[PDB]
Write a protein that binds this ligand. Structure first.
Ligand SMILES: O=S(=O)(Nc1ccccc1)[C@@H]1C[C@@H]2O[C@H]1C(c1ccc(O)cc1)=C2c1ccc(O)cc1
Ligand SMILES: O=S(=O)(Nc1ccccc1)[C@@H]1C[C@@H]2O[C@H]1C(c1ccc(O)cc1)=C2c1ccc(O)cc1
Lengths: 10, 237, 227, 9
């Protein structure tokens, strides 16, 4: 899921 | 953790520094406009705002303490509300108009270019008008937007909701703090607080109504939508 | 001028408590059976709700058109907050009627209802977990009626008065200033979720219009949400 | 002419 990864950056 | 130890002034300070920028559209006032044209412009604009919203939500005192699954849920529930309250906020200086972008000013008329959009526009216009007649402050706006983020999905092992409630109570204290500085009496503070929170109920309504129309449109495939926006939208259906 | 604004908070409360509709009974589980009992129940509650709204301070002062608009916008919200209120004493359950107790398992008998049930159960639990008083409930339900449709100055002034009434009640309960506006905020944020439950529940009513014959008044109440 | 018009009188 895209929202999953973008929140998980850094 | 950090969120609860913050005072009102440095809560405001944190929210103001965390503000996302105002993005520009790819609107060319030399082309013709249409249904797929507007929907294409708004889709691309909102898709870029979503990326900023995600990194904005991370800087909202408290959001980060939450598990990733809870952060996903809250954003999936409130993404359109946050976009809308941002829209009606920057549209305050332009009565009867909606400032989607510094180079994109639509009135009620151009809302008819898309089916079912003109009704939502009037609600957005009325909401923006309410903020205008109420003199909404930037410090108040960033409090309301953060409230929407933590409140949207709270009701929808882990009583992390209890932590969310604590942060919400802190933002409430912050709002009251701001109204006290503005010289409002105790009666005026509670009334204004209530007036603001009741508008949140309208932003919920506008979002839910717009989410149903944003689904009519996906089915059409008249205009494609980004992979993220589809996943945000699919979380509602 | 309105008679509503001249009232004090105690008699504003007294007016709301006295205007309260009665708790109706259901008839003495499948899809049609479930929708059948609820449609009938909700239909009889509407008649009481209409006469209840007429006894809400400030509502008569509005034009007939505005009264129609507000009722059309808030009718499901008002039924839902009435449901979660009486469902407090019964955690995990929904007191639709004194002789009609529905748990989550019966919400699955109707497509798209079980998830709305959960939101209703969580709303009732939230009201339970913070000791929602009846004087607060009648103030909240009145707010929903006036705030629903309102974005189409008098209503705002009545809404401010109801706000004063809520603080007036929390001041009676012995809450501090911080606790008063904190609790005030907590209650109003819940109204946002009741709006959410209504909208999500209203679109399902469209996808249910067929199963059981809906009454004329009901058809008209939900048809208004399609314009 | 809606039913809501009549009942509110
Ligand atoms: O509710 S809407 O109107 N829904 C809608 C209804 C019918 C057709 C399409 C969308 C929605 C609000 C407003 O206009 C629509 C919309 C929007 C349109 C397309 C899209 O892919 C995302 C959002 C808006 C918007 C965009 C960016 C913002 O920063 C703020 C708002
Ligand atoms: O949102 S709902 O669940 N919608 C719905 C969902 C799925 C299928 C059908 C309706 C709705 C709330 C709850 O159950 C549905 C419902 C209701 C159902 C049918 C009807 O004609 C009216 C109302 C409820 C209700 C009825 C009487 C009350 O006093 C209180 C609540």
């Amino acid at each position: 899921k895209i929202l999953h990864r973008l929140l998980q950056d850094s | 953790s950090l969120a609860l130890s913050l005072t009102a002034d440095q809560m405001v300070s944190a929210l103001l520094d965390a503000e996302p920028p105002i993005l520009y559209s790819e609107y060319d006032p030399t082309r013709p406009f249409s249904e797929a044209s507007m929907m294409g412009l708004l889709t691309n604009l909102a898709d870029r705002e979503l990326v900023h919203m995600i990194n904005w939500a991370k800087r909202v005192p408290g959001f980060v303490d939450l598990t990733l699954h809870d952060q996903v849920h809250l954003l999936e529930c409130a993404w359109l509300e946050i976009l809308m309250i941002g829209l009606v906020w920057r549209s305050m200086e332009h009565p009867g108009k909606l400032l989607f972008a510094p180079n994109l000013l639509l009135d009620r008329n151009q809302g008819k270019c898309v089916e079912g959009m003109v009704e939502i526009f009037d609600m957005l216009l009325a909401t923006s008008s309410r903020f205008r007649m109420m003199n909404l402050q930037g410090e108040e706006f960033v409090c309301l937007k953060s409230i929407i983020l933590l409140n949207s999905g709270v009701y929808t092992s882990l009583e992390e909701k209890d932590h969310i409630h604590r942060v919400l109570d802190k933002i409430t204290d912050t709002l009251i703090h701001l109204m006290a500085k503005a010289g409002l009496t105790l009666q005026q503070q509670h009334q204004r607080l209530a007036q603001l929170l009741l508008i949140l109920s309208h932003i919920r309504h506008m979002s839910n109504k717009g989410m149903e129309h944003l689904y009519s449109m996906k089915c059409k495939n008249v205009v494609p939508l980004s992979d993220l926006l589809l996943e945000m939208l699919d979380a509602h259906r």
